[PDB]
Design a protein around this ligand. Structure first.
Ligand SMILES: Nc1ncnc2c1ncn2[C@@H]1O[C@H](COP(=O)(O)OC[C@@H](N)Cc2ccccc2)[C@@H](O)[C@H]1O
Ligand SMILES: Nc1ncnc2c1ncn2[C@@H]1O[C@H](COP(=O)(O)OC[C@@H](N)Cc2ccccc2)[C@@H](O)[C@H]1O
Ligand SMILES: [Mg+2]
Lengths: 265, 775, 233
C-alpha cells in the first residue's frame, strides 16, 4: 500500500497563548510554594477600591478608568458566600482577591491569582481594555521586603537567566507602603522590561480585612503579621516570551494565529 | 531474634511490660515483628522423679516407677527415659495442647500407665518430641504442679539490624534500655579458680582466620540436666536444653553475642590446633552429618603425636564426637573471634546457618572473649560444680578502639536541635563511652562491643535515638539553588507533557516488564538482546527488552483471551536496551475501528493509526511524515519508517501476518519511536489579511510512485507564496494510463504585505507544472 | 522546590553499591538480592557522558542517582527521583521484583534532620491530613547516619503506614562524590555542606491511595484494570 498517503483527518487541538503563559507563570510560583486561586470578574466597589486604601473623590480613584454596571437580581457573593453590597463594576485589577482571600483564611500563606481584568482605555498594540494579570500575596509574621525581592528574582531566573537580574524602583500604590515598580533583565533581547508593581501590604488593608471579618463574626487574624503582594501584566509578558507583536491579537479569534502555539508544550 | 521478656528483665529489672518494651525498642532502632505468650501448663502436669525404669519383656517400652507425691507407674517408649531424672508428668485428666484427646489412665502392655511423661513437643514448650524432658531429679518436691516453676512467658520476635551485632546478646540490648535511664544488672561471674597448669596446648596456625582465640579449663564435671529456669529460658529463646554444660554455652552465647564451645578432653589429645582443613579431611558434625572439608575451611583440630584430626568447624558447628555428654569430667572451652568472611564463605559453602555462624558473620566483640570465659566458667562451677583453673590459653592481642572526635554543637547543628552539652555526654557515657577533653570538641572512645561506632556522625545518631527521634523539631529550609541546577526538570517534564497528550488523544497507557524471552527474538523477526541475566527470573525473562512493541502485542493477546475487547488503542513508554539504554515509545491499534456503532461502516486500519499520529505531532508542533521501509517484523507494503520533524526515528506499519498468525492473533498495527523527540522552537509569524489565491489541480503519475516525492515536488516548486497544499482526492482511474494515477490537490497562496496579482499566480503555477513532469 | 530528574535502569556496581557506603563481602551487600547482567558492546554512560566500568546490574534502588547528580552538580539543591527499580524476591501481593521508588535528596550548608522531618511532614499533610502526622524510627542504612524508617498517619483507614527510609547523607558518600569528581577533573563541591535523602515505595503507596489490593496488578496489562483509572484527574 501507499504508506506516504495522508491518514484520517483527525482534529488536533491547541491551547490559547494566555493559558499557556498563565500555566507557565503558575508552575513557576507553585515551585516556591504558592497556591493558585481565582476571583470573580464582577466585583463590588468595596473590594475593588474601598478595601484597598483607594479613595472616592481623590487622585487615587483616578488612576483606574472603570466600567460600571447596572441590572437587578444579580447576586454577588462575598468571601464567605454572603451577599455583599456596593456599586457593581468589572474588577479593575486582581487585587480585590487579596481581600476576599485574607477574609476567608488564616496566615501564614502564599497565593498567586491569575485573572481577566477590565479597564476603559483605548486599545492600541501594547494596551488593551480586556487583559489578564497575575496577583501574588504572601502573608506571615516576619515577612520583609527582601522576601518580595527574592521572590521576584526567582521569577526572572526562572524566565530568563541565570544571566538575568531584577530592578526595583519606588512607585506609589494606595494598598502597599513601601511601593515599587519592577523590571526584569532580558539577557537575550538586551533590554529592561517593566513587569508589574508590588510592595509591602498597607496597614489600612490589613485593618479593613479584620474589620470585615469581625463584621462577619470571625476573629481578627492579621494583627501583628506582615506581607507583600505584587501583580503583573500577563499579555505584556506572553508577548515578549512567545514573540507576539500586537496585544490585540489575543482576543482576535483568528485560528491561523491560535494554532501557531499548538505545540508550545 | 527471640527475646524472652522475663529473661531480659533479669538485666533490666524495672521493665514495665512487654508492650512498653516493644515501645522502648522501636525507639532504639529495633522493630518487633511479633509478640507471644508461651508456657501454658495445666494444673494437670506435675513434677515427678523416676525411681525405677523397668523395660517390658518382648517390647521396646519401659514401665517407669515415679515418685509423684504418691508412687505411680507410667509406660514410656522414649529412649532418654531412665532412673534418676525429673520428668513432666501429665496426670490422667490433663488437657494438652497437642492431643485433643485428654490424658488418661490406659493399660499399655500388662501395665496400666497412670498418665504419661512428656516430650517438649507434647508439653508445648518446644518442637522436639523425640524424647522426654529431662530435669534435675531434685528440681521440685514430687507432685508440685509444673506451672509453679514454669510460668508462661512473653517472647518478642525482634529485628536486629547488621549494624548492631552487639544486639544479638540480650545483655547487648539491656545496655541500651540502660542508656534510656533503666537500671542495668550485669551478671557477676563469681569464680573460685585454682593455680594448676593446663593439660593441653594451643597452636593457632591460621591467625588471619582466628584473630583472637582463648581456651578455658574445667574439670571434675558432674554433667546433668540443666536447672529449670535455664531450660525455660533456652526453650523460650528457641533453643533446646541438652545438659547443664552445653546449655551453659548456649545461654552465654545468647546473653553476650559470643558463641562458645565445650570440647571433651578425651578427644583433644595433646592440644588444640586452629588451622585450615587439609584437602578431603572428614568430619562428622554435631548434627550427625558426615562432611568433607575444603582447604579454605578454618577448623578446630587436635593432635596426638603426629596425628592431627578435626574436632569441629571453626565458628560454625562442633563435631559429633568431641561434644559433651554424661560421662565427661573435663573439657576445653573455645571462646574466640573468627574472621567474618571466612566463616561466611565456609558457612554458606556447606548447607549451614547456625546461631554461632550468624553471630560470627555479623561481628563479635574483639575483646569480649576473656570476660565471656569468666562468665561461662563461673556458671560451670555453679551448675556442674566444675573445678576451674585460673589461667587461660590466649592467642592474638587485638588492639582497642580509638577516640572519636566529638562536637556537641555539631550534633545539634546536624539534627537541628538544642540539647545541652551535659545531656549529650551523659548519654554517651551511659552507652559505655569514655569522654575526655574539656570542650568544645571532645575525645570519645567507644566500648569495643560497639563496632558500628566509628565516625562523629555515628555518635550523633546516638544522642538522637537516646533523646528520641520524636524530640527533633520540624523545619523547612530556604535557599537560592546553585545555578547549575536551574533547568534540570526540562527532560522529565517534556516526557510527561507527551505522556499526557497521548492519554488525551485517546491512548490507554500500559506498563510492561523490562524483561524479554530470548526466544521471541525469533518469534518476532528482530536481532538478539545485547544484555542477558546471570540470574534470570525465568528462561523467558532472561534477556532485556530491545523493543517495546513485542510486549504490547503480547499484551494484546492475553487481553483477548481474558476479556474480549472489540478494539484497542494503546501506548507505552519504557527503557529498551541495545548498545546504550534508550527511552522508546510505541503504540498499538487493533479492532474494527471508529465510526457509528450501529451504523455499518468503520474507518480503521493503518490509515487510522496514522491519522492519530499526524494529529499528535500537529499538537506537539512537529512536522512528521512516513516513507515506505522494509521491516523484518512488519508486513511489507504496509511497512514504513517514521520521520519526525526532518528526522528518522522509529517506524510504523501493520504487523507482519506471518507473526500475526504464529500467534492466535488477527491483524495489528504498530509504531515505535525513540525519545526524546526533537523540538522546533516556535517562531511566531504574522498572518496577512489579504485573501489567498485558490486553485484546482491534479497530477497523473505512475501507480507505484509514492505520494511523498509527489507532494514534495509540487511543494518545492509551488514558489514562496504557497500558503496551503492539500490532497482532496485520487483514484487509479479508467480515463487514463493503465499504470498512472490521479491526484486532487487544493492550493492556496498569500502575500503578507499585499494581495497577489494574478500575473504571479498562473505564472508560478506553471513554474510547477513545468518541472512537474518535466521531471 | 524539588526538581524531578531520572537515572538509568542499568547501572554499574560502583554507583549502586560502592558509591553508597555498601560493602562487597559484608552483611550490607546482603540486604538487596541483585540481578546481574552480561553482554558486550553495551555502553554505560557516567554522570558526565564518560564511560564507566563495573559489573553491570539492574539498579537495586534509586539511590545511585544521588551520586550521579551530586557528581554533575553544585549544591545547594533539592531533587526528587522517580524510577523503576529491580530486585530478585518472589512476587506476592505486597512485594514484587519490578517496582518503582521515589528518591529525594536535599544538599546544602546548614541542612539538618529537622528539615528532613519537616519535608516528610509536609508530604503527609499533602496526602492525608491536616489531621495526619509523621512517624520517624531509627533504622540502619549504609549511606545515611542518622538512619530512619518512617510511617505516615492515615486518619481515614486509621493505621500507620511504613513508607520508606531516609536519613542524613553519610560522610563516606560525600567523600566518594568529590573523589570521583576530582578523578574527572572537577573541584570538590561537597566538603562542608550537609544533606538528607529519603526514598519510598510508589506501588506500596499507589495501592493504599487508589485502593488497589494486589501489587501484581500493576504489571498485569489487563485493560479492565487499567481503564479503572481513566478519570483519576
Ligand atoms: N491597558 C493594559 N493592557 C495590558 N496590560 C496592562 C494594561 N494596564 C496595565 N497593564 C499591565 O498590568 C500590570 C498591572 O497594572 P497596574 O495598574 O500597573 O498595577 C496594578 C496592581 N494590580 C499591581 C500591584 C499589585 C500589588 C501591589 C502593587 C501593585 C502592569 O504592570 C502592566 O504590565
Ligand atoms: N519488593 C518490593 N516491592 C515493592 N515495594 C518494595 C519492595 N521492597 C521495598 N519496597 C518499597 O520501596 C521502598 C525502598 O526500599 P528499601 O530497600 O526499604 O530502601 C531503600 C532506599 N532506596 C531508601 C532510602 C533512601 C535514602 C535514605 C534512606 C533510605 C521501601 O520503603 C518499600 O516501601
Ligand atoms: Mg550508629
Amino acid at each position: 500500500v501507499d504508506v506516504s498517503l495522508p491518514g484520517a483527518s483527525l482534529f488536533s487541538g491547541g491551547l490559547h497563548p494566555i493559558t499557556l503563559m498563565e500555566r507557565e507563570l503558575v508552575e513557576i510560583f507553585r515551585a516556591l510554594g504558592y497556591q493558585a486561586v481565582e476571583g470573580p470578574e464582577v466585583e463590588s466597589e468595596f473590594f475593588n477600591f474601598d478595601a484597598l486604601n483607594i479613595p472616592e473623590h481623590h487622585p487615587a480613584r483616578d488612576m483606574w478608568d472603570t466600567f460600571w454596571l447596572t441590572g437587578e437580581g444579580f447576586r454577588l457573593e462575598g468571601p464567605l458566600g454572603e451577599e455583599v453590597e456596593g456599586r457593581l463594576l468589572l474588577r479593575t485589577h486582581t487585587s480585590p482577591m487579596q481581600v476576599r482571600y485574607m477574609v476567608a483564611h488564616t496566615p501564614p500563606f502564599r497565593i498567586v491569582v491569575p485573572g481577566r481584568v477590565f479597564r476603559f482605555e483605548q486599545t492600541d498594540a501594547t494596551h488593551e481594555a480586556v487583559f489578564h494579570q497575575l496577583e501574588g500575596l504572601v502573608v506571615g509574621e516576619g515577612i520583609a521586603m527582601a522576601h518580595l525581592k527574592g521572590a521576584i528574582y526567582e521569577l526572572a531566573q526562572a524566565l530568563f537567566g541565570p544571566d538575568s537580574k531584577v530592578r526595583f524602583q519606588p512607585v506609589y500604590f494606595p494598598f502597599v507602603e513601601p511601593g515599587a515598580q519592577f523590571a526584569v533583565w532580558w539577557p537575550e533581547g538586551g533590554k529592561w522590561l517593566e513587569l508589574g508593581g508590588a510592595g509591602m501590604v498597607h496597614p489600612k488593608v490589613f485593618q479593613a480585612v479584620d474589620a470585615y471579618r469581625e463584621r462577619l463574626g470571625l476573629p481578627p487574624a492579621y494583627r501583628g503579621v506582615t506581607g507583600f503582594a505584587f501583580g503583573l501584566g500577563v499579555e505584556r509578558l506572553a508577548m515578549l516570551r512567545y514573540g507576539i507583536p500586537d496585544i490585540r491579537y489575543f482576543f482576535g479569534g483568528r485560528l491561523k494565529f491560535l494554532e501557531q502555539f499548538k505545540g508550545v508544550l | 531474634m527471640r527475646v524472652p521478656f522475663s529473661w531480659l528483665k533479669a538485666y533490666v529489672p524495672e521493665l514495665e511490660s512487654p508492650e512498653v518494651l516493644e515501645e522502648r525498642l522501636a525507639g532504639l532502632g529495633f522493630e518487633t515483628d511479633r509478640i507471644e505468650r508461651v508456657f501454658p501448663i495445666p494444673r494437670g502436669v506435675v513434677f515427678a522423679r523416676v525411681l525405677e525404669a523397668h523395660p517390658i519383656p518382648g517390647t521396646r517400652l519401659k514401665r517407669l516407677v515415679l515418685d509423684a507425691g504418691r508412687t505411680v507407674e507410667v509406660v514410656s517408649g522414649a529412649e532418654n527415659a531412665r532412673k534418676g531424672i525429673g520428668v513432666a508428668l501429665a496426670l490422667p485428666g490433663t488437657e494438652l495442647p497437642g492431643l485433643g484427646q485428654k490424658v488418661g489412665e490406659r493399660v499399655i502392655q500388662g501395665v496400666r500407665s497412670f498418665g504419661m511423661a512428656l516430650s517438649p513437643r507434647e508439653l508445648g514448650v518446644g518442637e522436639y518430641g523425640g524424647g522426654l524432658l529431662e530435669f534435675p531429679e531434685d528440681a521440685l518436691p514430687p507432685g508440685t504442679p509444673l506451672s509453679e516453676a514454669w510460668p508462661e512467658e512473653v517472647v518478642l520476635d525482634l529485628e536486629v539490624t547488621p549494624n548492631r551485632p552487639d544486639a544479638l546478646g540480650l545483655l547487648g540490648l539491656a545496655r541500651d534500655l540502660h542508656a534510656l535511664g533503666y537500671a542495668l544488672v550485669e551478671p557477676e561471674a563469681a569464680l573460685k579458680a585454682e593455680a594448676l597448669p593446663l593439660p593441653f596446648a594451643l597452636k593457632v596456625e591460621d591467625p588471619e582466620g582466628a584473630p583472637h582465640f582463648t581456651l578455658g579449663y574445667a574439670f571434675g564435671l558432674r554433667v546433668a540436666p540443666s536447672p529449670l529456669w535455664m531450660q525455660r529460658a533456652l526453650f523460650a529463646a528457641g533453643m533446646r536444653p541438652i545438659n547443664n554444660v552445653v546449655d551453659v554455652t548456649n545461654y552465654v552465647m545468647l546473653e553476650r553475642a559470643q558463641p562458645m564451645h565445650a570440647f571433651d578432653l578425651r578427644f583433644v589429645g595433646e592440644g588444640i590446633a586452629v588451622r585450615r582443613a587439609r584437602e578431603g579431611e572428614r568430619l562428622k558434625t554435631l548434627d550427625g552429618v558426615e562432611r568433607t572439608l575444603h582447604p579454605e575451611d578454618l577448623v578446630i583440630a587436635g593432635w596426638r603425636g603426629e596425628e592431627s584430626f578435626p574436632l569441629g568447624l571453626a565458628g560454625v558447628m562442633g563435631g559429633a564426637e568431641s561434644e559433651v555428654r554424661e560421662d565427661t569430667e573435663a573439657i576445653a572451652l573455645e571462646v574466640a573471634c573468627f574472621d567474618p568472611v571466612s566463616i561466611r564463605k565456609t558457612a554458606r559453602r556447606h548447607g549451614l546457618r547456625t546461631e554461632a555462624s550468624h553471630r560470627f558473620e555479623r561481628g563479635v566483640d574483639p575483646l569480649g572473649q576473656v570476660p565471656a570465659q569468666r562468665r561461662a566458667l563461673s556458671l560451670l562451677q555453679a551448675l556442674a560444680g566444675a573445678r576451674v583453673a585460673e589461667a587461660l590459653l590466649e592467642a592474638g592481642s587485638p588492639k582497642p578502639p580509638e577516640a572519636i572526635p566529638f562536637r556537641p554543637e555539631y550534633a545539634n547543628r546536624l539534627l537541628g536541635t538544642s540539647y545541652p552539652e551535659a545531656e549529650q555526654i551523659a548519654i554517651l557515657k551511659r552507652l559505655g563511652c569514655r569522654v575526655e577533653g574539656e570542650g568544645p570538641t571532645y575525645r570519645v572512645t567507644p566500648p569495643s562491643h560497639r563496632l558500628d561506632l566509628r565516625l562523629e556522625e555515628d555518635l550523633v545518631e546516638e544522642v538522637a535515638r537516646i533523646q528520641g527521634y520524636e524530640t527533633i523539631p520540624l523545619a523547612l529550609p530556604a535557599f537560592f539553588p546553585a545555578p547549575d541546577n536551574r533547568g534540570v526538570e526540562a527532560p522529565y517534564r517534556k516526557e510527561q507533557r507527551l505522556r499526557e497528550v497521548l492519554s488525551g488523544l485517546g491512548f490507554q497507557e500500559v506498563y510492561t516488564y523490562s524483561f524479554m524471552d530470548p526466544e521471541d527474538a525469533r518469534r518476532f523477526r528482530l536481532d538478539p538482546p545485547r544484555l542477558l541475566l546471570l540470574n534470570p527470573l525465568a528462561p523467558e525473562k532472561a534477556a532485556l527488552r530491545t523493543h517495546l512493541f513485542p510486549g504490547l502485542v503480547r499484551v494484546l493477546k492475553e487481553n483477548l483471551d481474558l476479556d474480549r475487547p472489540e478494539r484497542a488503542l494503546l501506548f507505552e513508554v519504557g527503557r529498551v536496551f541495545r548498545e546504550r539504554e534508550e527511552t522508546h515509545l510505541a503504540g498499538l491499534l487493533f479492532g474494527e475501528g471508529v465510526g457509528l456503532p450501529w451504523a455499518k461502516e468503520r474507518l480503521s486500519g493503518y490509515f487510522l493509526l496514522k491519522g492519530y499520529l499526524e494529529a499528535l505531532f500537529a499538537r506537539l508542533g512537529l512536522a512528521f511524515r512516513v516513507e515506505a521501509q522494509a521491516f523484518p517484523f512488519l508486513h511489507p507494503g504496509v511497512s514504513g519508517r517514521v520521520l519526525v520533524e526532518g528526522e528518522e526515528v522509529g517506524f510504523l506499519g501493520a504487523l507482519h501476518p506471518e507473526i500475526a498468525q504464529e500467534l492466535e492473533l488477527p491483524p495489528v498495527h504498530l509504531f515505535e519511536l525513540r525519545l526524546p523527540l526533537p523540538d522546533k522552537p516556535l517562531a511566531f509569524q504574522d498572518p496577512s489579511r489579504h485573501p489567498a489565491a485558490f486553485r484546482d489541480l491534479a497530477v497523473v503519475v505512475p501507480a507505484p510512485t509514492p505520494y511523498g516525492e509527489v507532494e514534495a515536488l509540487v511543494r518545492e516548486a509551488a514558489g514562496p507564496y504557497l500558503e496551503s497544499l492539500a490532497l482532496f482526492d485520487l483514484y487509479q482511474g479508467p480515463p487514463l494510463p493503465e499504470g498512472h494515477k490521479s491526484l486532487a490537490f487544493h492550493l492556496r497562496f498569500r502575500h503578507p504585505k499585499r494581495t497577489l496579482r494574478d500575473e504571479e499566480v498562473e505564472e508560478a503555477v506553471s513554474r510547477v507544472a513545468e518541472a512537474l513532469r518535466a521531471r
